[PDB]
């Protein structure tokens, strides 16, 4: 269900549009794709919102060409979706790399658009280490990451998703959650990796206007909860919320509080 | 610099390129190659920047293949010249079909590396008549010219330069202009004038951020001014200069003010 949207190069980029009402506007994370948002978008629909959920180029259904994986070229594929649906009032929810092209999307494109923004898990201002910025996987790190992926794909998504959540959950929902990623591209899995551990938004956030939530888990380890606070620190007039028993995924770890919290932000 | 730019499929590019200083990209109309560009390139090199003339496959000194000739990839040829040589804050001037691969160009691959847009006498935003855009030839007027080319190109070329500029220039002047396009392939010459017929970049015209120019020539016969009005009006913030004594070859038709305007242009947005 729901179209596909030409992005301004053609690709073919699938929204899944449902549901009623002010628009929730909800980007993955790496290496997923939207389905990763199931049980808040089901939680969207019965308190009367409408979900838009998209898949990026590479990933999901959407196409996967061989360039645009950078946060610039990811930021205009979210305009042309916003363009194309006539989006406003919207509430837009960035995870971990999601969060990032969010960010890039309200610098290069503006902020009229988005009400609110959620940053969950966000990857941002950075993904990786820099001048007093001690926090997170090294670009070292992040290269022996695409080798890895290189060399045995499902071996590292496993990997991944042992570093992902802080608990354990049952095996069906980990399996589910490790065949969105596997059916990901490999060369846009690794194009983004590598976007991962280049691009950098510090200066642009001291710029943001947007009314602001940050949803974070303490015991991340994919980006650590300083993130967090960094971006609580940068943004001016955000909410920090403290994800206390959640490692990155605490759309699992803490599904009741991850999706109550998104609901009654939607709201207020 | 030197020589040949590899394709995505492997076709060799070749280009050239000449000085040191801001790059300045020119792509050359249908069918000739990128030494029309001449009387410019000497102005340019003399100011100080770098000229990078791009001969499209098919033409020039490029190799010819089969396939390729759609604007698609003819901009993906362009993405190549750019990202092999490393070039940044390129001033990008497209002629005729120039115009049109080089908004292909910046729609596929994005605006990062281009500082400006000049689109001089742009096959842009469609070259043949459609729908509602009652402007150029009509499609039955292209496929007559590949007709043409199937049976007797050089008599076809004699015919398009005829139509292509407003000034009858001199004869050894003429003759430059019309061996630099007997050069072409005849198989690229084909290919490229099916993408003129088929090609339409309505669509792409208002996603356009980079500052643009637009020159054309008030007495174009090849693409008739009035897809320079079209332009102006959906590329953002774009500049328009009138050129009131020239037809499509303003290059010549108005050389001095040609020049001097693209000169002007590349020195400030």
Same mark, same amino acid.
């Given at each position: 269900?729901?179209?596909?949207?030409?992005?301004?190069?053609?690709?073919? !980029?699938?929204?899944?549009?449902?549901?009623?009402?002010?628009?929730?506007?909800?980007?993955?994370?790496?290496?997923?794709?939207?389905?990763?948002?199931?049980?808040?978008?089901?939680?969207? %629909?019965?308190?009367?919102?409408?979900? !838009?959920?998209?898949?990026?180029?590479?990933?999901?259904? @959407?196409?996967?060409?061989?360039?645009?994986?950078?946060?610039?070229?990811?930021?205009?594929?979210?305009?042309?979706?916003?363009?194309?649906?006539?989006?406003?009032?919207?509430?837009?929810?960035?995870?971990?790399?999601?969060?990032? *092209?969010?960010?890039?999307?309200?610098?290069?494109?503006?902020?009229? &658009?988005?009400?609110?923004?959620?940053?969950?898990?966000?990857?941002?201002?950075?993904?990786?280490?820099?001048?007093?910025?001690?926090? $997170?996987?090294?670009?070292?790190?992040?290269?022996?990451?695409?080798?890895?992926?290189?060399?045995?794909?499902? @071996?590292?998504?496993?990997? #991944?998703?042992?570093?992902?959540?802080?608990?354990?959950?049952?095996?069906?929902?980990?399996?589910?959650?490790?065949? %969105?990623?596997?059916?990901?591209?490999?060369?846009?899995? *690794?194009?983004?990796?590598?976007?991962?551990?280049?691009?950098?938004?510090?200066? $642009?956030?001291?710029?943001?206007?947007?009314?602001?939530? *940050?949803?974070? $888990?303490?015991?991340?380890?994919?980006?650590? #909860?300083?993130?967090?606070?960094?971006?609580?620190? &940068? !943004?001016?007039?955000?909410?920090?919320?403290?994800?206390?028993?959640?490692?990155?995924?605490?759309?699992?770890?803490?599904?009741?509080?991850?999706?109550?919290?998104?609901? @009654?932000?939607?709201? @207020?």
């Amino acid at each position: 269900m729901g179209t596909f949207i030409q992005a301004v190069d053609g690709t073919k !980029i699938y929204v899944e549009d449902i549901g009623s009402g002010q628009p929730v506007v909800m980007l993955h994370g790496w290496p997923a794709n939207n389905n990763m948002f199931e049980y808040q978008k089901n939680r969207l %629909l019965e308190e009367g919102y409408r979900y !838009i959920g998209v898949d990026y180029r590479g990933y999901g259904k @959407s196409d996967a060409p061989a360039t645009g994986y950078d946060y610039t070229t990811m930021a205009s594929d979210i305009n042309e979706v916003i363009q194309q649906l006539k989006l406003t009032n919207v509430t837009l929810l960035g995870f971990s790399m999601g969060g990032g *092209i969010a960010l890039k999307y309200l610098l290069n494109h503006g902020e009229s &658009n988005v009400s609110k923004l959620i940053l969950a898990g966000a990857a941002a201002p950075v993904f990786t280490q820099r001048d007093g910025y001690p926090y $997170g996987m090294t670009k070292d790190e992040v290269d022996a990451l695409i080798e890895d992926t290189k060399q045995d794909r499902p @071996s590292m998504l496993k990997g #991944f998703g042992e570093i992902f959540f802080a608990k354990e959950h049952p095996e069906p929902l980990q399996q589910w959650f490790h065949n %969105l990623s596997v059916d990901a591209s490999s060369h846009g899995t *690794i194009q983004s990796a590598i976007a991962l551990r280049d691009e950098d938004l510090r200066d $642009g956030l001291p710029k943001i206007t947007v009314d602001t939530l *940050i949803m974070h $888990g303490k015991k991340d380890q994919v980006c650590p #909860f300083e993130f967090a606070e960094v971006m609580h620190e &940068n !943004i001016a007039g955000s909410r920090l919320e403290v994800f206390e028993e959640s490692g990155h995924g605490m759309f699992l770890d803490e599904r009741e509080k991850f999706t109550e919290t998104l609901v @009654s932000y939607v709201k @207020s």
